[PDB]
Amino acid sequence: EVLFQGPGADQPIDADVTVIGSGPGGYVAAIKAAQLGFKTVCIEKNETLGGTCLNVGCIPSKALLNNSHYYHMAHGKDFASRGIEMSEVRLNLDKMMEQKSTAVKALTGGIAHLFKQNKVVHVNGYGKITGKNQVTATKADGGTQVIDTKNILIATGSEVTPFPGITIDEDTIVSSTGALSLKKVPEKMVVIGAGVIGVELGSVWQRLGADVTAVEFLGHVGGVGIDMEISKNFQRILQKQGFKFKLNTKVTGATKKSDGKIDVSIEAASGGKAEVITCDVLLVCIGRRPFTKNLGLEELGIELDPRGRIPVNTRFQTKIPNIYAIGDVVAGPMLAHKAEDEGIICVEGMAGGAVHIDYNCVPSVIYTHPEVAWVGKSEEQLKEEGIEYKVGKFPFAANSRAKTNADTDGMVKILGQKSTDRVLGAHILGPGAGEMVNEAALALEYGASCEVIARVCHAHPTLSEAFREANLAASFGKSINF
Amino acid sequence: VLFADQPIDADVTVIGSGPGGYVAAIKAAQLGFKTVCIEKNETLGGTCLNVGCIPSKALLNNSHYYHMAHGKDFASRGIEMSEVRLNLDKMMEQKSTAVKALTGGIAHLFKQNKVVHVNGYGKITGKNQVTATKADGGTQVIDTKNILIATGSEVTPFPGITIDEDTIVSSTGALSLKKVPEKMVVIGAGVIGVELGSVWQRLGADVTAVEFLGHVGGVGIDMEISKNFQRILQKQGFKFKLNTKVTGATKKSDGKIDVSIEAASGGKAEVITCDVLLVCIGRRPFTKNLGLEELGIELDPRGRIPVNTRFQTKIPNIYAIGDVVAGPMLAHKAEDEGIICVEGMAGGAVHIDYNCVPSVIYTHPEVAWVGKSEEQLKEEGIEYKVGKFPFAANSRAKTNADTDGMVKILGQKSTDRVLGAHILGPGAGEMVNEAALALEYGASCEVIARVCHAHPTLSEAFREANLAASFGKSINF
Ligand SMILES: Cc1cc2nc3c(=O)[nH]c(=O)nc-3n(C[C@H](O)[C@H](O)[C@H](O)COP(=O)(O)OP(=O)(O)OC[C@H]3O[C@@H](n4cnc5c(N)ncnc54)[C@H](O)[C@@H]3O)c2cc1C
Ligand SMILES: Cc1cc2nc3c(=O)[nH]c(=O)nc-3n(C[C@H](O)[C@H](O)[C@H](O)COP(=O)(O)OP(=O)(O)OC[C@H]3O[C@@H](n4cnc5c(N)ncnc54)[C@H](O)[C@@H]3O)c2cc1C
């Protein structure tokens, strides 16, 4: 294949666009560039395409959350309450892990097919930018291949942020990558960090039978930008499921022991209150950071911001104007759909089009049960900016679909601009949050008012009616069903 | 309370407490109208709560979980169960708990909103008066400025077949069968029939639906969608006889039923025996004993009450909404008509576009749609483009291993305006509400594809089908 240039393929090539990395940013940018008429190359170092999201991220984590949630429903009260009677429910963890790998495998292979269908040249190698118009790929056999290119698109992604003095071995001290592949349910697990990723993987193992505590330096669960009331109610729900939390707590260190266990040393974040908690697996997920190793940036003189990111303009140009960057290597929320959207518009701009994105319209989702999802501003952001607003809330306990399914934790909260009725934020805690937020993203895109939303005919019975009614309550002062 | 009868004085008197009427009464009260709601049955909530959307969704949900457990699905995810039993009584009890909770909820919302509840059979006895007659013959007279008729629908009978709710059931009896029938025949493969048929098939019944028309899913379903849907349900074990009329059914001495059918064009007579015959050929508007003939309000040839765009009958202080009037017979349509009818009584604008009203079928896979089908755009001569995106290329669906179906988007050639959206597959019911928002906005396919959808979501299929209709290709397929 002209379309696959792996070890032993080392002839010089030319391209209009050369994308470095095949994660959500890069693979979508490559496909789009080819569809716009650009002769396109995508360079990837790993054995599969799809990056962090496909291989060790969104995909395998959602598979395990979907399966562990079914396990919990089968194993607990839920199924027996519906007349579905089982003698024994057993965990087969090999088999659940196989369902996960099958999905990854299919989706990673899908990308390769898409690249082929759209004539994207896939170079398997490590790409280094060796001049303003050139990338050199080094291959697994030591070989090298030069790409002569008009434009370069950096989409090199992120890595796990290491924790100083705790060495991640992916055995009993694991990152998200090793958490996704434990070979047995651990009796006790400590999670360092109660961000989205930690909460999700913690919840997975907790449902499968682990005792789980998450330790977090900050005062709230679910990461940056989550509305505080949502976070607090979410926390409370997770705690009743048996997830434990130590917030405002730092981890001062950890030690592997002769019994095989791990003593985690912790104290209050302000100072004081030393304790040790002991666990079988220690999951370290304090963060992710941009990945730009060996890319050639220093030599080209592209300087990083202090967090490791590549500074870009509104068209995603670095300070060298034919060298662009997107996704988790640049500023903004480190999310797959944000990387894909940046990819698309970057490459559209290279072809002549307009380039604007507002990160406020980027939703977030936590795929626990209940789910959490939001888009636009939190109440904390509105107070900080001096914006005057009204609140509408509608609990899932008063929604008919949620009541019929007997799945009624949570609420929708809508934040509207006090004078104009403009929808400023939507926050959803409960069943179907992750799908429902997309209706809210559509509305924010057009600048909808809470009234416009409330006037749209939503299907009955649907979880979406909670969204409709929280808008009606923001707009009119009261909903119909609560 | 209870110490020569006294009339109630009201601004608005609502006859019926289903989705249309209960909602209209709450809203009226919230707008400051002194409001009364009359209901003849023992509980509030009408067809939807008591014998309709609610109990049917409860059984669909629970039977689906039963099919996942009893089948291979849970095994495949490493959830290993030694034996899986149905306890039908307990599944029915979960259904009844949901119904009871929600019907009591409405009584509570009428108290919270100061809606006066009258329990009786309501007859309009004057341009400004309704009389309710209780089950014991006691009368309550309400003298009222406006009257809102929200008297709903009933089961359409099949001529020559008598439903007795025992072996020959309507939807109501189908929802309370005491035991899984060995064999069931369903007359009608519309939304209600497909749903209740699927429930009982998952529970172990051999189910066949017989339908006069050539497609499943009822009126206005897109044909491509409908064919694909029927294929999937056939692979689940649900059998269909399309282009087939039922000529009659005989209640046999041994307790079974003999159903006679043949081709809808003519010919091919055969008889199929079953244990339960579900008759679901339709629903019709219910106006019995309401006093219309005496006020001079004539019905249309289908039995509906003709109203203006503000929901006024020919007597302008008497209104009608929901399943008793024209347009799709759906709960959310009745609810919207009730809210806007009462806003219009306070002097505001009244707008509902029926083309924007979604439909959902709560089978697994779900089906849902809003706006126009390909068939409708062809009849109207509209030039359009098509985008399709299969759930098999959707990340979330693939991750869940639940990958039947597709999103299909119909776009206008000249302007890129979205004209219809059609969803077969996981999450279709909730997904159609983003689609309804788009159809209401007259949004363009280009703009919907540009909106930042969360990854991985089933909604990305919707986003990419829009992309495909607008630019001509999607990213992931
Ligand atoms: C456990 C977990 C769960 C998550 N869940 C979600 C979620 O549910 N939703 C969501 O939106 N986000 C989620 N994320 C975040 C999401 O994975 C990232 O935001 C996303 O993958 C970033 O895409 P990208 O294209 O910028 O980078 P990456 O996916 O990190 O892809 C970078 C690619 O570049 C390659 N590469 C780097 N340097 C070079 C080089 N010099 N030459 C060649 N190749 C190179 C890497 O091998 C990699 O394949 C999750 C992440 C984790 C870890
Ligand atoms: C099995 C089944 C499943 C369904 N699934 C769905 C679905 O999933 N989604 C959907 O949108 N729709 C669904 N429907 C349709 C929905 O039930 C109706 O469209 C909706 O209930 C109509 O609401 P309404 O307020 O017009 O009438 P109705 O709900 O039928 O309420 C009419 C009420 O008026 C009362 N009444 C009538 N005359 C008088 C009188 N003269 N005095 C006092 N009271 C009176 C009745 O007793 C009843 O309570 C379903 C229906 C059925 C049968």
**DSSP assignments along B391-405, one per residue:** GGG-HHHHHHT----
What are the DSSP calls for A330-395, one per residue? Answer: SSS---HHHHHHHHHHHHHHHTT------GGG--EEE-SSSEEEEEE--HHHHHHTT--EEEEEEE
Measured CA distances, B426 to A79, A385, B253 (Å):
21, 40, 44
Q: Is B455 a catalytic residue?
A: yes
- Least Cα distance to B343 among B198, B148, B182 occurs for B148
> Taking CB atoms and an 8 Å cutoff, what residues of chain B touch A364?
454
Closest-CA distance of chain A to residue B271, Å: 35
Integer Cα distance of B25 and B15 in angstroms: 10
Instruction: Copy the structure tokens of residue A108.
Output: 């990673």
CA of B148 to the centre of ligand 2 (A): 15
Residue type, A205: W
Instruction: Copy the structure tokens of residue A9.
Output: 């393929």
Give B 294-323 residues with CB within 8 A of chain A: none
Question: B199 touching A, CB under 8 A?
Answer: no
Nearest to A480 among B26, B76, B357 (CB): B26
Integer Cα distance of B286 and B40 in angstroms: 13
Beta-carbon count within 10 A of B336 CB: 27
What are the DSSP calls for A383-427, one per residue? Answer: HHTT--EEEEEEEGGG-HHHHHHT----EEEEEEETTT-BEEEEE
Residue of B nearest to A461 (CA): B53
Instruction: Copy the structure tokens of residue A46.
Output: 């790993």
- Ligand 2 closest atom vs CA B335: 25
A460–B53 CB contact, under 8 Å: yes
Query: Which residue stretches of A150-227 are H helix?
Result: 176-179, 196-208
Element (H, E) at B69: helix B53-70
Query: Could you give phi then psi for residue A388, rounded to 5 degrees?
Result: -85, 130
Element (H, E) at A262: strand A262-268
Integer Cα distance of B279 and B88 in angstroms: 22
**Could you give the 3-state DSSP secondary structure of residue B360?**
strand
Query: Could you give phi then psi for residue B143, rounded to 5 degrees?
Result: -100, 125
Question: A221 touching B, CB under 8 A?
Answer: no
Measured CA distances, A192 to A251, B205, B444 (Å):
8, 51, 45
- Has A22 been labeled as part of a binding site? no
CB of A157 closer than 6 angstroms to any ligand 1 atom: yes
CA of A329 to the centre of ligand 1 (A): 9
Question: B115 touching A, CB under 8 A?
Answer: no
- Least Cα distance to A340 among A10, A27, A2 occurs for A27
- Least Cα distance to B421 among B430, B432, B413 occurs for B432
Determine if the peptide bond prior to B456 is cis (ω within 30°). Answer: yes
- Least Cα distance to B368 among B378, B357, B376 occurs for B357
CB of B334 closer than 6 angstroms to any ligand 2 atom: yes
CA of B19 to the centre of ligand 2 (A): 7
Closest-CA distance of chain A to residue B187, Å: 25
Integer Cα distance of A306 and A374 in angstroms: 28
Residue B226 burial class via C-beta count within 10 angstroms: exposed 0-12, middle 13-18, buried 19 and up: buried
Q: Which ligand is nearest to the CA of B39?
A: 2
For helices A24-35 and A93-117, what crossing angle results, to 10°?
30
Integer Cα distance of B149 and B133 in angstroms: 16
Residue B415 burial class via C-beta count within 10 angstroms: exposed 0-12, middle 13-18, buried 19 and up: exposed
Query: Could you give phi then psi for residue B35, rounded to 5 degrees?
Result: -130, 140
Look at the block and give the residue holding tokens 């339908």: B211
Integer Cα distance of A365 and A428 in angstroms: 9
Identify whether the C-beta of residue A47 lies closer than 8 Å to the C-beta of residue A22.
no
Q: Does the CA dihedral B271-B272-B278-B281 come out positive or negative?
A: negative
Closest-CA distance of chain B to residue A143, Å: 32
Atom 48 of ligand 1, residue of closest alpha carbon: A51
Which of B112, B434, B445 to mutate: most A Cβ within 10 Å? B434
User: Which residues on neighbouring strands pair with residue B412, listed in sequence order?
Assistant: B384
CA dihedral B260, B261, B266, B267 (to 10 degrees): -70
A458–B451 CB contact, under 8 Å: no
Integer Cα distance of B470 and B385 in angstroms: 8
Integer Cα distance of A424 and A374 in angstroms: 11
Instruction: Copy the structure tokens of residue A456.
Output: 């749209």
- Least Cα distance to B92 among B63, B118, B69, B68 occurs for B63
Integer Cα distance of B435 and B358 in angstroms: 9
Which residues lie below 8 Å from residue A212, measured CB to CB, with a gap of 6+? A188, A189, A190, A191, A202, A203, A205, A206, A242, A243, A244
Query: Which residue stretches of A276-335 are H helix?
Result: 297-300
> Strands of B257-263's sheet, edge to edge?
B244-251, B257-263, B270-274
First to last CA, chain A: 62
> Within 13 Å, how many C-alpha atoms sit on residue A217's CB side?
9
What are the DSSP calls for A18-76, one per residue? Answer: EEE--SHHHHHHHHHHHHTT--EEEEE-SSSSSHHHHHHSHHHHHHHHHHHHHHHHHHS
**Could you give the 3-state DSSP secondary structure of residue B136?**
coil
Which residues lie below 8 Å from residue B11, measured CB to CB, with a gap of 6+? B28, B33, B34, B35, B144, B145, B146
Q: Which ligand is nearest to the CA of A55?
A: 1
Give Cα B26 to chain centroid, integer Å. 22
Question: A207 touching B, CB under 8 A?
Answer: no
Closest-CA distance of chain A to residue B105, Å: 8
Element (H, E) at B16: none
Resolution in angstrom units? 1.8
CA B312-B316-B322 angle, to 5 degrees, is 25
Give A 7-66 residues with CB within 8 A of chain B: 24, 28, 31-32, 35, 53, 58-59, 62-63, 66
Residue type, B336: D
CA of A342 to the centre of ligand 1 (A): 14
Measured CA distances, A401 to A432, B114, B430, B476 (Å):
11, 26, 10, 32
Give B 422-461 residues with CB within 8 A of chain A: 427, 429-434, 436-438, 440-441, 443, 447-448, 450-459
